[PDB]
Amino acid sequence: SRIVDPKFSSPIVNMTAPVGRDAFLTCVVQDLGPYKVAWLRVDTQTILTIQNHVITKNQRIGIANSEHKTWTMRIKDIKESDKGWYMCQINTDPMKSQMGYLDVVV
Amino acid sequence: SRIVDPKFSSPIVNMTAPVGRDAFLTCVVQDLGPYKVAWLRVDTQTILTIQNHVITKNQRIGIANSEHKTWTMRIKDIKESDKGWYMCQINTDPMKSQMGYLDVVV
Ligand SMILES: *[C@@H]1O[C@H](CO)[C@@H](O)[C@H](O)[C@H]1NC(C)=O
Ligand SMILES: *[C@@H]1O[C@H](CO)[C@@H](O)[C@H](O)[C@H]1NC(C)=O
């Protein structure tokens, strides 16, 4: 039995934030179902989170969701090196994703 | 206490295979410890596996390991669109990774 793919309800909300403040990036998914939402950093090619699990060893990354639709990654105490592109990816076949950015102003 | 990072014992052996055969890529890691090995398709940064869990919906992907040292991703019944670069990634900080290539000949 085939099920619908999840669909993104809105584009990724980007964030601009000063060094040392906390940053958030949010992905809004409709009809997630049995699929999973993963955050990745695109510059560094690094897996950050999958569902409610932080994969990276970086202790400043957190992840939370409400109703499996709004998925918000937290980057605690941001440094200048956190500036870059971040992907919200769903494990459909083919894979679907959208990208946002965190800008760290100096 | 700090622990060692895992280290790759050898490069990933590439593989060339004809359409319809099974293919394998192997990543050999030393001192994995509490860290995790993930396989990704580099073209799109599609998360394929994490540890012994297949993340992608693609039912032709499999993962196995022996003693948390040798990590082997299998691609069953390969197609031309399986040709490309694959990354073996460890969730250290900073992230560590090796890449291999699956060439599919028609
Ligand atoms: C975030 O930035 C990208 C390009 O910089 C843009 O396409 C996207 O729509 C932005 N997000 C929002 C919510 O506007
Ligand atoms: C794998 O392939 C790449 C290019 O296809 C090559 O440069 C590299 O040396 C190969 N790795 C090994 C271990 O042979």
Residue numbers in the entry:
A (entry chain B), B (entry chain A): 38 to 143
Study text:
We have recently identified interactions between two groups of Drosophila IgSF (immunoglobulin superfamily) cell adhesion molecules with properties closely matching a neuronal chemoaffinity function: 21 Dpr proteins, named after the founding member Defective proboscis extension response, selectively bind nine proteins, now called the Dpr-interacting proteins, or DIPs. All 21 Dprs and nine DIPs are predicted to contain two and three immunoglobulin (IG) domains, respectively. Our previous work identified the first IG domains, termed IG1, as the domains mediating the Dpr–DIP interaction by the formation of a pseudo-symmetric IG1-IG1 heterocomplex using the GFCC’C’ face of the immunoglobulin fold. Therefore, Dprs and DIPs are strong candidates for a synapse specification or targeting function.
As we purified and crystallized several Dpr–DIP complexes, we were also able to grow crystals of DIP-η IG1 and determined its structure at 1.9 Å resolution, which revealed a homodimer. These crystals only grew in the absence of Dpr1, which indicated that the heterodimers are likely more stable than the homodimer under the crystallization conditions used. The homodimeric DIP-η structure closely mimicked the Dpr1–DIP-η heterodimer: When DIP-η monomers were aligned, the other subunits, DIP-η in the homodimer and Dpr1 in the heterodimer, were only displaced by an RMSD of 0.78 Å for 87 out of 102 Cα atoms, excluding the variable DE loop and the mobile half of the A strand. The crystal structures also reveal how DIP-η can accommodate binding to both Dpr1 and itself, with significant differences in sequence at the interface. For example, Tyr103 in Dpr1 (Y, F, or H in Dprs) is replaced by Ile92 in DIP-η (I or V in DIPs). This results in rotameric differences in close-by residue Ile87 in the common DIP-η subunit, which is further accommodated by other rotameric changes in the common DIP-η subunit, and sequence differences between the heterophilic and homophilic partners. The DIP-η homodimers observed in crystals also exist in solution. While size-exclusion chromatography is not an equilibrium experiment, a binding isotherm based on elution peak volumes can be calculated, yielding an apparent KD of 11–45 µM, an order of magnitude weaker than the heterodimer. Furthermore, we performed SPR experiments where low density DIP-η surfaces are created to prevent homodimers on chip surface, and data is fit to a binding isotherm while correcting for DIP-η dimerization in solution, yielding a KD of 14 µM. Here, we also show the presence of DIP-η and DIP-α homodimers in solution and present a symmetrical DIP-η homodimer structure that closely mimics heterodimeric Dpr–DIP complexes.
